[PDB]
Amino acid sequence: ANLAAFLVLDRPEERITGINDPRLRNPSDKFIYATVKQSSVDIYFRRQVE
Amino acid sequence: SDCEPDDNHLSIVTLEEAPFVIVEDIDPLTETCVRNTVPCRKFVKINNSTNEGMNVKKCCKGFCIDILKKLSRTVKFTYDLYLVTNGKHGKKVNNVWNG
């Protein structure tokens, strides 16, 4: 039963699930993520300045 | 020119020690502040002996800032922010408060 429960418990649903995530809200040094350059994504990020 | 009795100044002092109001300073880029923020002036401590402090403008944003903005857009009062120098909340020592 313990082995079955441990096998069932896997979680790890990519830990992001879209833009709305605490990891993306507060930047983390360990988790590195960014865009390429001053592209439309960069303009959108600057426009939604929060 | 001659005289004008007006009101709605309402100087406000806020504490830079709670998550409801950030301590963000002037950034070198854009308009020296955030696109969604309000000005706030705080006396600085240039030296440990001299109490003189330059009133450098700062960008204050937070829950209290949003509440103040809503109040301003509702009751139409033109506000100006401020920050105290000694203490945050204070206490009644010899009938004198602080903060």
From Swiss-Prot, chain A:
List localization entries: Cell membrane; Postsynaptic cell membrane; Postsynaptic density membrane; Synaptic cell membrane
Q: Which residues bind glycine?
A: 40
User: What would changing residue 4 to T do, according to UniProt?
Assistant: In NDHMSD; uncertain significance
Q: Which residues are glycosylated?
A: 26
Q: How is it modified after translation?
A: NMDA is probably regulated by C-terminal phosphorylation of an isoform of GRIN1 by PKC. Its phosphorylated state is influenced by the formation of the NMDAR-PPP2CB complex and the NMDAR channel activity.
Quaternary structure, from the entry: Heterotetramer; the NMDAR subunits are modular and harbor tiered domains that function in concert to regulate opening and closing of the cation-selective ion channel pore. Forms heterotetrameric channels composed of two GluN1/zeta subunits (GRIN1), and two identical GluN2/epsilon subunits (GRIN2A, GRIN2B, GRIN2C or GRIN2D) or GluN3 subunits (GRIN3A or GRIN3B) (in vitro). Can also form heterotetrameric channels that contain at least two GluN1 subunits and at least two different GluN2 subunits (or a combination of one GluN2 and one GluN3 subunits) (in vitro).
The role this protein plays is:
Component of N-methyl-D-aspartate (NMDA) receptors (NMDARs) that function as heterotetrameric, ligand-gated cation channels with high calcium permeability and voltage-dependent block by Mg(2+). NMDARs participate in synaptic plasticity for learning and memory formation by contributing to the long-term potentiation (LTP). Channel activation requires binding of the neurotransmitter L-glutamate to the GluN2 subunit, glycine or D-serine binding to the GluN1 subunit, plus membrane depolarization to eliminate channel inhibition by Mg(2+).
Family label? Belongs to the glutamate-gated ion channel (TC 1.A.10.1) family. NR1/GRIN1 subfamily.
Q: What is known of its domains?
A: A hydrophobic region that gives rise to the prediction of a transmembrane span does not cross the membrane, but is part of a discontinuously helical region that dips into the membrane and is probably part of the pore and of the selectivity filter. The extracellular N-terminal domain (NTD) is a site of allosteric regulation to modulate overall receptor function.
Q: Which disease is it linked to?
A: Neurodevelopmental disorder with or without hyperkinetic movements and seizures, autosomal dominant: An autosomal dominant neurodevelopmental disorder characterized by severe intellectual disability and developmental delay, absent speech, muscular hypotonia, dyskinesia, and hyperkinetic movements. Cortical blindness, cerebral atrophy, and seizures are present in some patients.
Q: What is this protein called?
A: Glutamate receptor ionotropic, NMDA 1
Swiss-Prot record, chain B:
Tell where it localizes.
Answer: Cell projection, Dendritic spine; Cell membrane; Synapse; Postsynaptic cell membrane
Q: What is the effect of changing residue 56 to M?
A: No effect on localization to the cell membrane; changed glutamate-gated calcium ion channel activity characterized by increased glutamate potency
Q: Which domain of life is it from?
A: Eukaryota
* S-S bridge residues: 33-59, 40-60
Per the UniProt annotation, where are the glycans attached? 47-48
Please give the subunit comment from the record: Heterotetramer. Forms heterotetrameric channels composed of two GluN1/zeta subunits (GRIN1), and two identical GluN2/epsilon subunits (GRIN2A, GRIN2B, GRIN2C or GRIN2D) or GluN3 subunits (GRIN3A or GRIN3B) (in vitro). Can also form heterotetrameric channels that contain at least two GluN1 subunits and at least two different GluN2 subunits (or a combination of one GluN2 and one GluN3 subunits) (in vitro). In vivo, the subunit composition may depend on the expression levels of the different subunits. Found in a complex with GRIN1, GRIN3A and PPP2CB. Found in a complex with GRIN1 and GRIN3B.
Reproduce the free-text note on domains from the UniProt record. Contains an N-terminal domain, a ligand-binding domain and a transmembrane domain. Agonist binding to the extracellular ligand-binding domains triggers channel gating. A hydrophobic region that gives rise to the prediction of a transmembrane span does not cross the membrane, but is part of a discontinuously helical region that dips into the membrane and is probably part of the pore and of the selectivity filter.
Q: What is the name listed in the Swiss-Prot or TrEMBL entry for this protein?
A: Glutamate receptor ionotropic, NMDA 2A
Per the UniProt record, the source organism is: Homo sapiens (Human)
